[PDB]
C-alpha cells in the first residue's frame, strides 16, 4: 500500500533525525531512507499532493544529511496525506484539480474525468410501555408472539365461525386461506385486476367488492357473510385506499368486519401520506365522520336521490354507509422489523371495533389461547421498537430508496436499459400529490420498487441469478417475466444501494458494448428477445369456480374449502396427474379439481386452492412459471387431483340437503 | 430431535397436526394442561378423556392407570370404532410428580392397537438426566428399549408363549391380563416434547420435539415439516431449525453439571426435612407410599423385613418395574399437620422466589419445584422458614392448652381428616357424541356451537341442581378451568353431572377461567340441544342411506 | 476443559513448549500467562505494545514489532529456538488483532512456529458481522485454504520475484507471504463458555487447528490435559471428544445477538443524546488505533455494511463493538473516582477497568434494555449536574474545572516500555530473551535478595549499582506485570512506580521496597552463566 510505505518512510526519517541528534552513525538510517524513497518513487508520480517533484526535493535534501529538514517535511506530508490526501474530486488529463499525466490510465489508482476508452470505463467513473405505545396508536394493541400468520389466524378465529362466508382477496397471504380452512368458513374469492403487460396482479377494484356483495344479496346468502379480508399494500406494492372501501362496503352490509393484512406496508409510518392510507387512520376518520350531523345531512341528501334506483344497480353509484346502522368493526395486523434471529416472534393486532367488547372479546381471548400463550402477553416486543424508531432506519431507507430511483432515472447509462415502474404503469387508468394520495383508489409504496428489465430481454429469474449473484442487502424476493421487485428494508445500507447502482451501470455497459458489436441478425435476435417477453404475455389465469361437490349452493360462488382440503388427505380418493397430461385429460372431458394449495416461492399468493377446478389458463401458467420451489405441488409426481369417483360421491352427498 | 423456538405448546401443536386429522379419535389424559385441549379443538380430533385415579385425601389427581387405557381401547374395540383411534396423548411426569412407566404403557397399548402413535409431554420431567435411574422412564429411551426388544428372536419366542398362554381368552378380558405387543404388527411411533432449561425459567422460550418414529421417513415427514413451518414461520432459518440436533447439542456437558447440582440440592433438602425433628414433627414429604396407591406397585416397604433407610439407592427395581414413581425434584410438602391451607401457607408464610417454586398450592399441601436456580443458600433458606414455622407451631401448642387445643384439632381435622369429592369426567352429551355407544366427543363442534349467542343461556349454580332434577339437562358450552385443579373440569359439550356442580359450588374464587359466578354457568338451551341431536341423527342417516 | 481459561493455556503451552524454548509473549498479557511461562522453563521474549499515552493505556503489538523481533533473533542465529507466538486475539481495551496477517507474515519468517491466541475477551465475535473472520480458527481455515491453492503458489512466485535481491534483514520493511511448502499452520485458541464468575468459574475450551497435531503433538497434548486436570474415569473429554460439529447453541446465538444489538443501541444513544455527548464520548478506531496501522482512510452505526467491511478485512487493528471504552476526560474526573462513586450501585455491564481518564464498558449476557437505559440515565444525570455546576462557575471555578480537565489530558505520564533483561539472566548476551524461570527461583534466596526504597533506586542507578528485580510486579492500573524476575528496573519504570500510592500492588510494597538482587549475587550469577556458556561450547 502507498500510505504504508509513506508511513514507513516517515518513521525512517524520524529515526534519522533521532540518530543525528544523538550523533551516532546515521548511514544506516540514510540507507533505509534512500531505499524507502526508491521504493515509493516507482509509483508516486500517479498522485497529486506528494508528487514525484516532492520526492525529488526530499531526495535532494537527503543527499546533504539535512536530518532536521526531512523529519519535519516528510511527517507533515504524511499527516496531510492521512487527513486529506489530494484535497490538501480529482480529474485526469491525457472543487477540482488536474493530474496532467502523459501515461494516461496508469493512474486509475489515484482515485475522475478521462483510443476506445473502454478500459478506462471499467476501472473508474463509469462504474457507480406507556412511553413506547403513545406514538403509533392509542386505541388498541395486541402483541402476538408467533408472527403475522399467527395474528391473522387469531383474528380470523375470533370473528369467523363455521357457516360464515368471507370475501377474501384471491391472492392474499396463504395464512389467510389456511385460517379459512381452519375455521370452516366458505371463501368467496375477490379477483384482482391484472397487468398482462407484466404478469402481476394489482389489487381488487372496489367495484368487484360491491358486485360480490350484491351477488350475495340476490342469492340471499348476504346475511351469512361475515368479514372482508384484503391485503393492504400488496406484494407488488399497490396500496388500497381503506377509507373508500370501508365507506362503500358498509353501505351494503352495515355490520361486516374488516381485516386488513398490512404486514408488507411496513413503511406507512415513515411518510405522512402513507400514514393516512393505513387502515387504523381510516377507521378513525370513518368513525368520526359517521357521528357528525353534517354527515347525517349529506347522507339524507344522498338517499333522497338513491331511492330512485334499484339495489341491483348500486354497483355503479357511489354508496355511503347508513350512520344509523354502520358499525365500524375493522381490524389490522402489522409485522415488526426482525432481521434473521430464527424467531419472527413479534407481531401486532390493531383493533378498532365498536362491538369487540360486547361480542368478540371472549372469542378473541380464546383465539389467543389457541394460537398463542396469553399469560406472557409483551413489553419486550414494544421496548425495542421505540429504540428502532430512535434510530430512524425507516426514514433513512426511504430516503435512500428515493435517491436510488432518482439515480436510476437521471443517469443516462442505466436509464438506457432500466427503469422503475411507477403509477403510470402499475395502476390502470380506470382507477387513477398530497391530496392525490387521498383522492384516488391506488398508489404505489415508494419502498417496493419494480425494476423493469425488459430492454435486457432477460426474464426475471435469469436476470436475478446472472447479474445479482451477491446481494449485500436489497431483499430482492420476487422475479417476474420482465421485471424484479426490490424491497427496501431497514437492513439495507448505503453501500448496498451503491453496489446495486454499480451493478446496473456495469450491465448497461455490457449491453452497450454488445449492441455496438452486434449487427444484422444477431442484433435482431436481441430485439426479438426484448420483444417476446415485453410485447406478448399470456393473460393471468382467472380464478375458477369451486366445484359443485363443494359449493353449498349452486347459484353462489363460495365453497366449502375446508372439506375439500381435508377430504384431499384420503390417498385413495385423489391421484396425481402430470400437468402435461392434465390438458389432454380435460380435452377428454374429464373434470379436474385440485386437492391442495399450490403456493410458489413468491410469498402468499396460491395459484390453486382445495376444490378449485383446474382450467387451461392455470395449466399454462403452471407450465410457464420458471421457479419450481412450490408448496403442495410436485414437479415430477404431478398435480394431485380428485378421483371422479370421489367427486361423484361428494356431489351426490351434498345434493341431499 | 428438532429445535422449536416457540415453547412447548407449539411443539405439541406441531406433532398433533403432523399426526392427526379431523375426526380421528385421540385418547388424552384429561388432567393435562389446558393448552392440550385447545390443540384438540383446533385439530378437529375427538378426545376420549381418560380419568386419573383420585387421591381425595390430598385433593390431588394421579396418573391414568394402564388398565384404564386398556379398558378405554377395548370399549372402542367392542364398538367397532377402534380403527379411528390415532393417538395416546399422555403427560409424562404429571405436574403432581407422578411418573409413568412408558415402556410398559407402550407394550400393552401396542398389544391392542399395533399402529398407534404416542405423544408424551415431558416438559415437567426435565431433571431425569441427573437422577441415576430416571432416564429409563423417558419416552425416548423406553422407545429405544422397546424397539430393541421387538427386534430379538428371544422376544418372538416369549410372545409365542404369551399368546399361547392367552389362548382361549376373549379380547374383552385382556383388561385383566398382562399383554405383549405382537412383534409382527406393533410399530413404535413415539414422540416427546420437552421444554428447554431457559423455558424452565419463568420466561418461556424454546422446546424440542424428540422423535422415535419407525414410519416418519415414509408416512409423516412431509406432514411434519409442513406443520413445523405452519406453526413457526415459512422463512429462512426455519429450515435450519428443521435440521436435526440429536448427535449435536453436546453443550449440555456444562448443563449436566447444573442439573446434577440441582438434583443434589433436592436430595439434601429431602434428607434435612426428614431428619430435622423440629421440621419433621409437622412437615412431611409425600413419597410412593402416600401418592401412589399400592395397587400400582410391587415394591412394598413393610413386606421385606431387611429394610434400609432409603436415602441411599436400595430401591432400584421400583424405577425399572413399578407403574408409578415420584420425580425426586418435584417434592410435594404435606402441611396438614400444621392446619394451614396450602394457598395460605405459600402466599403468607414464605413467599420464596430466590430458588425453588410453589406453582401449585393444594388444599393441605404445597408442591415444591426445584429449578435450575436453586443453590445451597436457597435450600437452607427454605429449611430455615420451615424451622421457624415449626417453632411457632410448638409455641401455639404450648399456648393451645388454654382452650385452643380444640381450635388446633379443628383446623387439622377440617383440612386433613375431612375431604371433598374429586369430580371425575362426566360424559359428552348425545348432541356431541358421533356414536351413541362410545364416549368420545365432537368437542370442536361444541366449542364453535357454543358461540351462538342465541343457543347459550346462563344458569346460576344454586339452580343447576333443580334444573338437573327437573330433567332440563345441563351441557356446558365452554371450557371451565378452576385454579386449584389446574385443568379443565368442564369442556364444550360435557354434561355437568351432579358431582361437578357440587364441586363448582364450593369455589370462592370468582375469576375462574370459563365461568363466572356473577352471571352463571354457560349452558346450551334445551331447544338447541334438541336441534343438535336431530342434526346428528340426520348425519347418522345420510352417512348410511 | 472443565477449568478456567488459564488451565487451557497451561495445557497447550506444556503440550507445545519444552524448557529452553523461546516464546514470543506479549508483555501486556495478564500475569497468569507469565506465570505459566515460568513453569516449563520457557524463555520469554517480551513484545512491547504501541503506547497510547493520552489515555495511559496500551494497544496491541504492531506486526512490525513481531517481525523485527523474529528477525533480530534470526541475526543472532538463535531463531531455531523460537517455538511459539503467544498473543491475545482481543486486547482488554478491545483492540482486535487481524490474525490472518499476523500469521501470514510470521510464517514467512518462521515456517513452523505454533500460534496460541487467548480469545477469552473476544466472546461475542459470533454475533458481530465481519468479526468471526478475525478469530484464530477462521483465520487458520482461510490461511490453510489459501496455502493449498495453485493461484497462491503463483502469487508467492511473483512475490519472491519482487523481493528478489532484497536483503533478508530488510524483510521488516516489506510485507511477507508464507512459503506454501514450508509454512505449517499450527494455530491454537482458548476461551470461556460463559463461565459464572466467583462460583464454578471453570468453563473453557481449547480450539485446535494444527496440521501436525496427530503426528507431533497428540500424545503430549493428551498427557498435558491429564496433568493439568486430574485423571478420572471421565477421560473422554480429553481424547477423542472432538466436539467441532457439536455443542450447537441456537439459544446462545440468540443471546449473543441480543447482547450485540444491545451494545449497538447503547453506542448509538450515547452519541445522539445531546446531553450525554456534550461530556462523554466512546473511543473509536480514529482514537485508539494510530493511523499508521489503518490503511483505510478518509456513519458506521447506521448502515455501514459493505463500506466499512474493508476495515475488518485489511486493517491491523479494530475495536470489538462490545468492549466500549467510555472516555470521561471532558468530565474532568478520573476514572477510578467516576467508577467508585457514580457507578457504585453497579449493573450487568462489568465496568471492570478504569484508566486515568476513561472507563471500559464490557457488555455481558446479563444485559437487558434496562441495563442500557440505567447506564444512559446515569450518564445523563452526570451530564445535567456538570452543566449545572459549570453554569454556577465563577472565573476561579472555571480555572479549577479547566485545570481538572488539563491534568488528566495534557501532561499524562510516560508509559513504561519493557526494559531489557539483566545480563545475569540472558542466556545469549546478544539477545533480549531471558531465563525468567531461574530469576524467579533465584529470587527466593533470602540472602541474594535486597530491599531498596523507590527513592533510593534512582540514586542507585546514578551511582552505577544496577537494579534487577527478583519478582513479578503487577500494579492495578495497567493490570499486567511492569516488572518480571530478572528484569532491569530502568529509570522510567522507577519513575512510574514512584507515582503509585496504592500500597497493595502485587509483588511490591512501598513500605518495604523493591525486592532487588544484591550486587554480589548478580556478579556471581553472571560469572556462573559465563562458565556455563564456556563449558557448553568448548
Short mmCIF file of C-alpha atoms in Angstrom, two decimals, chain C residues 419-426 448-452 456-470 483 486-491 494 514-524 526:
data_model
loop_
_atom_site.label_atom_id
_atom_site.label_comp_id
_atom_site.label_asym_id
_atom_site.label_seq_id
_atom_site.Cartn_x
_atom_site.Cartn_y
_atom_site.Cartn_z
CA UNK C 419 13.36 -2.84 29.88
CA UNK C 420 15.71 -5.49 28.53
CA UNK C 421 16.58 -8.49 30.70
CA UNK C 422 19.56 -8.26 33.01
CA UNK C 423 22.78 -9.77 31.70
CA UNK C 424 22.94 -12.35 34.50
CA UNK C 425 19.82 -13.97 33.00
CA UNK C 426 20.10 -13.52 29.24
CA UNK C 448 20.56 -12.83 47.50
CA UNK C 449 17.51 -10.57 47.76
CA UNK C 450 17.68 -6.96 48.95
CA UNK C 451 15.15 -4.17 49.56
CA UNK C 452 15.64 -0.65 48.19
CA UNK C 456 16.85 5.23 46.65
CA UNK C 457 16.58 3.23 43.41
CA UNK C 458 17.06 6.25 41.14
CA UNK C 459 20.10 7.28 43.15
CA UNK C 460 21.44 3.75 42.88
CA UNK C 461 21.12 3.88 39.09
CA UNK C 462 23.04 7.15 39.09
CA UNK C 463 25.75 5.54 41.23
CA UNK C 464 26.08 2.65 38.76
CA UNK C 465 24.99 -0.24 41.00
CA UNK C 466 22.39 -1.65 38.61
CA UNK C 467 18.98 -2.70 39.92
CA UNK C 468 17.41 -6.03 38.94
CA UNK C 469 14.00 -7.12 40.23
CA UNK C 470 13.65 -10.55 41.81
CA UNK C 483 8.47 -5.96 36.12
CA UNK C 486 15.45 -10.58 36.39
CA UNK C 487 14.21 -7.51 34.52
CA UNK C 488 16.29 -4.36 34.82
CA UNK C 489 14.35 -1.63 36.61
CA UNK C 490 15.14 1.12 34.12
CA UNK C 491 14.82 4.73 35.21
CA UNK C 494 11.23 3.56 38.77
CA UNK C 514 11.74 -3.15 45.62
CA UNK C 515 12.82 -6.77 46.05
CA UNK C 516 16.07 -6.47 44.08
CA UNK C 517 19.15 -8.64 43.68
CA UNK C 518 22.24 -7.88 45.72
CA UNK C 519 25.19 -6.75 43.64
CA UNK C 520 27.45 -9.64 44.65
CA UNK C 521 24.67 -12.12 43.85
CA UNK C 522 24.36 -10.62 40.36
CA UNK C 523 28.12 -10.79 39.83
CA UNK C 524 28.18 -14.43 40.94
CA UNK C 526 26.82 -13.61 35.71
#
